[PDB]
Enzyme design. Sequence first.
Site, PDB file in Angstrom:
ATOM      1  N   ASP A   7       0.873  -1.177   0.000  1.00  0.00           N
ATOM      2  CA  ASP A   7       0.000   0.000   0.000  1.00  0.00           C
ATOM      3  C   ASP A   7       0.897   1.210   0.000  1.00  0.00           C
ATOM      4  O   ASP A   7       2.110   1.089   0.177  1.00  0.00           O
ATOM      5  CB  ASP A   7      -1.024  -0.025   1.170  1.00  0.00           C
ATOM      6  CG  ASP A   7      -0.498   0.131   2.536  1.00  0.00           C
ATOM      7  OD1 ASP A   7       0.658  -0.171   2.850  1.00  0.00           O
ATOM      8  OD2 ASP A   7      -1.339   0.584   3.404  1.00  0.00           O
ATOM      9  N   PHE A  28       6.532   2.573  -4.059  1.00  0.00           N
ATOM     10  CA  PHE A  28       7.838   2.853  -3.475  1.00  0.00           C
ATOM     11  C   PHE A  28       8.510   4.143  -3.963  1.00  0.00           C
ATOM     12  O   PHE A  28       9.498   4.568  -3.346  1.00  0.00           O
ATOM     13  CB  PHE A  28       8.836   1.676  -3.635  1.00  0.00           C
ATOM     14  CG  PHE A  28       8.291   0.419  -3.015  1.00  0.00           C
ATOM     15  CD1 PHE A  28       8.336   0.244  -1.646  1.00  0.00           C
ATOM     16  CD2 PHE A  28       7.739  -0.582  -3.804  1.00  0.00           C
ATOM     17  CE1 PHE A  28       7.872  -0.925  -1.059  1.00  0.00           C
ATOM     18  CE2 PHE A  28       7.240  -1.737  -3.195  1.00  0.00           C
ATOM     19  CZ  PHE A  28       7.309  -1.906  -1.838  1.00  0.00           C
ATOM     20  N   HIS A  80       8.994  -8.258   2.243  1.00  0.00           N
ATOM     21  CA  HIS A  80       8.887  -6.845   1.977  1.00  0.00           C
ATOM     22  C   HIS A  80      10.166  -6.127   2.421  1.00  0.00           C
ATOM     23  O   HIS A  80      10.791  -6.469   3.418  1.00  0.00           O
ATOM     24  CB  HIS A  80       7.618  -6.309   2.693  1.00  0.00           C
ATOM     25  CG  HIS A  80       7.242  -4.908   2.325  1.00  0.00           C
ATOM     26  ND1 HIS A  80       7.925  -3.814   2.821  1.00  0.00           N
ATOM     27  CD2 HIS A  80       6.279  -4.478   1.479  1.00  0.00           C
ATOM     28  CE1 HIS A  80       7.336  -2.753   2.285  1.00  0.00           C
ATOM     29  NE2 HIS A  80       6.335  -3.098   1.476  1.00  0.00           N
TER      30      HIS A  80
HETATM   31 NA    NA Z   1       4.016   4.040  -2.501  1.00  0.00          NA
END
Ligand code: NA
Length: 228
Positions: free
Chosen positions: A69, A82, A192
């Site tokens: 998200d 990102f 992640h």
């Molecule tokens: Na983002």
Amino acid sequence: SMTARPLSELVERGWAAALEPVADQVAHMGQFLRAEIAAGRRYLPAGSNVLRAFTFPFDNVRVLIVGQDPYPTPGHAVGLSFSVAPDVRPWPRSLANIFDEYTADLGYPLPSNGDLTPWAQRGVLLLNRVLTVRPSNPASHRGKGWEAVTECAIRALAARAAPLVAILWGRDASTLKPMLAAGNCVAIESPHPSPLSASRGFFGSRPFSRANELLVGMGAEPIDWRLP
Ligand code: NA
């Protein structure tokens, strides 16, 4: 506005057709966001950036990167997983970790800034599994309707008569794996890059070189990952 205008206006032409099965769902997410504001809650990224990943051409995607998200801190998320604007500093911690793996894998110097638009312009889809978040509250919009949208995006990519390499970062991204079953698609999965999970296998994962190896093995051109 995704409540008010159609996909043919909101996103690139190929993506508008790809997302046809979720047209009503996208409008519904616009209505959800309206109701959040009416209730006094905020969301990120800015409304006009929510569908930004789908403004680069669908037919050109060769790699997708999928995160969880958007960044939770106001001033960071820009609608491309990102990425941050080229004037943001310090970088978010997830991004600093991504760039340390980028240097370790590829041997390139650290990028000048955190703007990943070159990747998007070179055939990398920068997707989050969920496309909005409430400030300061990671995962706050999980389960609110975005998952059907991003599922549809992946199925549509996977159905094209083209090779695809997916890089799935983290648990929510990993729920797209079933949709990549066909033989023209290959998935790389790792933990992640945030500090809460990166040391479980994101560092040392060499996703960029592996993605290129996979593309070449499918007859596709590798990505130029080099950022300025
Ligand atoms: Na983002």
